[PDB]
Structures are given as structure tokens and as C-alpha cells.
């Protein structure tokens, strides 16, 4: 029969910890504040607009 094994690349990039809501809430919001990219910067590019 066909062997039907997983490829190695699946295993290499698979997290095997069964993360749950507290872990996902933390591990998704780890790092510098998202307001570094969730902001806007204003410029007086054209006095006419």
C-alpha cells in the first residue's frame, strides 16, 4: 500500500504544544505595542488641500 507519511517540512514548522486561550491571548499580543503600526502620521504636504 501507499505509505502515506507526513513530509518533513510539515513537522519542522509545526508547533506541538496544544496552546489554549490564555496562551494564545498572550503569545499573539507579545512584543512592542501594536500601536506602532496601528497609527497614522499627518503631513502638511499641500497647503492647498
Amino acid at each position: 500500500p501507499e505509505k502515506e507519511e507526513t513530509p518533513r517540512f510539515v513537522e519542522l514548522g509545526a508547533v506541538t504544544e496544544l496552546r489554549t486561550e490564555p496562551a494564545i491571548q498572550f503569545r499573539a499580543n507579545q512584543g512592542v505595542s501594536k500601536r506602532r503600526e496601528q497609527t497614522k502620521v499627518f503631513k502638511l504636504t499641500d497647503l492647498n488641500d
Binding site: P7, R8, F9, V10, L12, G13, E37, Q38, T39, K40, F42
Partner: protein, 160 residues
């Protein structure tokens, strides 16, 4: 996503969402089913896309899998394919999100710095993603393929 970008841009100006933005999010909402379908196709054929696109990449860049290349050997070539798999996953995220923000933040800010630390060639990573785009387009219909191909195009453009 489009919704979060609109909310961010409006919060900075302290303005409730203008009708110009509200129609944009309404459009994205309406085409959501097609977007989910495209992503579902890509995740179904995750393993085929990565496998054969990687084979194309190694065919066009034999130096990469040749001895002394970055992805030389069984485990090293698997990590190279793992990176391609990561970018496919980011592409599906971007497709359902409706913008390139998830792709940009998760995997294109400092991509050159990371790959130069690793010693990997950025143009060869770009060609691998190009091969993935070709395979994914073959698995999509013409309208579906061109809608997703733009996310692939953003990824390769940042790689360059």
C-alpha cells in the same frame, strides 16, 4: 484587514467611519465567501503546492540544493520548504483578511535582515514564492487565481 485599517484611520482623525469607508468594508464583506473559498483551496492543497513549487525552485536554482548551498541535505532542504510553507500560510491569511497587513507584519518586516543573518539568498526565496504562485494559480479559476496572485506578488516584491 480592511475593517481594522478603516477603524485605525478613522480613530486617528477621531471621526466615525465615513460612508466612503463604510462602503469599502461592505464590499469586502460581500466578497468574503469567494475569499474564503480561495483560501480553502490553498490550504487543501498545501502539501502539493509546497512540494512541487520547491522542486521547481531547486530546478531553477540547483546551487541552492547543491553542496555548499544554504539548503543542502535532507533537513536543510526541509527547512527551506518550511519557509515556503510559512509564506503560503501567510498568503491564505492575507486572502481572507482582504489586505496585505497580516502578510506584512508576520513575515515581510525585516525579511532581508533575517535572511542575511541566516546566510540565505533573498532572490532565491523570491523565486520559490513565484513557483508557489504559479502552482496556486493552476489550482484556482482565472478570477480566483488573479485575486490571490496579487498577494503572492506583494510577497515576491518585498523579497526582492
Amino acid at each position: 484587514s480592511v475593517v481594522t485599517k478603516s477603524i485605525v484611520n478613522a480613530d486617528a482623525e477621531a471621526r466615525y467611519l465615513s460612508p466612503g469607508e463604510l462602503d469599502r468594508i461592505k464590499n469586502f464583506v460581500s466578497t468574503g465567501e469567494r475569499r474564503l473559498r480561495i483560501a480553502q483551496t490553498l490550504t487543501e492543497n498545501r502539501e502539493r503546492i509546497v512540494k512541487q513549487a520547491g522542486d521547481q525552485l531547486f530546478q531553477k536554482r540547483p546551487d541552492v540544493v547543491s553542496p555548499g548551498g544554504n539548503a543542502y541535505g535532507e533537513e536543510m532542504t526541509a527547512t527551506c520548504l518550511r519557509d515556503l510553507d510559512y509564506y503560503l500560510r501567510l498568503v491564505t491569511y492575507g486572502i481572507v483578511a482582504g489586505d496585505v497587513t497580516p502578510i506584512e507584519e508576520i513575515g515581510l518586516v525585516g525579511v532581508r535582515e533575517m535572511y542575511n543573518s541566516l546566510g540565505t539568498p533573498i532572490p532565491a526565496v523570491a523565486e520559490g514564492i513565484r513557483a508557489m504562485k504559479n502552482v496556486a494559480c493552476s489550482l484556482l479559476s482565472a478570477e480566483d487565481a488573479a485575486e490571490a496572485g496579487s498577494y503572492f506578488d506583494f510577497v515576491i516584491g518585498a523579497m526582492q
